[PDB]
Amino acid sequence: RSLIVTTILEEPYVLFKKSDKPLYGNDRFEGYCIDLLRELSTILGFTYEIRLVEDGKYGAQDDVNGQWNGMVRELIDHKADLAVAPLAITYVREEVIDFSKPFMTLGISILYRKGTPIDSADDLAKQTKIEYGAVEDGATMTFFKKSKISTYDKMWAFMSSRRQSVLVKSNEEGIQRVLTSDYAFLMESTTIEFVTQRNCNLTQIGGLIDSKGYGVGTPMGSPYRDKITLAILKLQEQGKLHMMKEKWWRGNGC
Ligand SMILES: N[C@@H](CCC(=O)O)C(=O)O
């Protein structure tokens, strides 16, 4: 019962602790997902070693060879026993990996600047002066890539024509793109809440375009999946997931 847990750096889910003296092993990290992993470990009774996903991606399937990358691929390859991260539960992913029930719910929305006349995805879709995109090889990118809704297909045609420019490596790169250029970022609503509380000139535009949840990923057939679902439901009912979110979102900014 010693497990390897894969994750990815993403504020406020997983971040390096700030320390004068270097820290080692799991002690290096903090954040909402680290707190969740600690609780799961206590409830389920396993120890673990946190590994950061080597390719730095959440996970998407290659058009050409059907192969996955990112944390999803780490689970398929058995490089990790669990992925404890803001990993979106999606039908395409469910075909190759298992997820616990969700520990947080959210949807794709738009991060942009306040006071503009952009009010929705439809407003972005119909123009080209304001660029827009998403994190490369993550769920939001895959949503647009596969959607048959005209508005979202129109946005994918745009994003996919300027991929090198608008599809970014991380939420951090997308936030900087928003701050340094005329760009709207398609990102998950939980993360937008965090970002806008720290940059008062930024805001969510429109509502949630879809609805999904984050769950702990496991290789298909893992005995840990059902046990982790049970632990999450218990944490949820006890109010612990709500406290954890307040602790890291610090709804104090702005
Ligand atoms: N949480 C997303 C990554 C960020 C995004 O796609 O907006 C994922 O699981 O793929």
Structural domain boundaries in the chain: 1-106+212-254, 107-211
Phi then psi dihedrals of residue 81, to 5 deg: -90, -30
Element containing residue 142 per DSSP (H, E): helix 139-146
Q: Specify whether the CB–CB gap between 84 and 40 falls below 8 A.
A: yes
Instruction: Kindly report the number of other CB atoms within 10 A of residue 128's CB atom.
Output: 11
Both ends of the chain: CA-CA distance in Å?
A: 44
Residue type, 204: Q
- Asked whether the domain spanning 107-211 has the same topology as the one spanning 1-106+212-254, the reply is yes
Residues 6+ apart with CB under 8 A from 33: 7, 13, 14, 84, 85, 86
Ligand 1 centroid vs 21 CA: distance in angstroms? 32
- Angle formed by the axes of helices 240-249 and 32-44, to 10°? 150
CA of 134 to the centre of ligand 1 (A): 9
Give the C-alpha separation, 196 to 191, whole Å: 9
What token pair was written down for 17? Answer: 């602790």
The structure was resolved to a resolution in Å of 2.0
Radius of gyration of the chain (CA): 18
Could you tell me whether strands 2-7 and 82-83 are parallel, antiparallel, or unpaired per DSSP bridges?
A: parallel
Q: Which CATH class is domain 107-211?
A: alpha beta
Residues with CB under 6 A from ligand 1: 58, 86-88, 134-135, 138-141, 187-188
Task: Supply the residue whose CA is at minimum distance from atom 3 of ligand 1.
Answer: 138
Distance CA 165, CA 153 (A): 18
- CATH 3.40.190.10 at 1-106+212-254, yes or no: yes
Tell me how far the alpha carbon of residue 89 lies from the centroid of ligand 1, in angstroms: 10
DSSP strand E in 11-149: where?
15-16, 29-30, 47-52, 82-83, 97-99, 104-106, 108-113, 131-133
Q: Is 88 a known ligand-binding residue?
A: yes
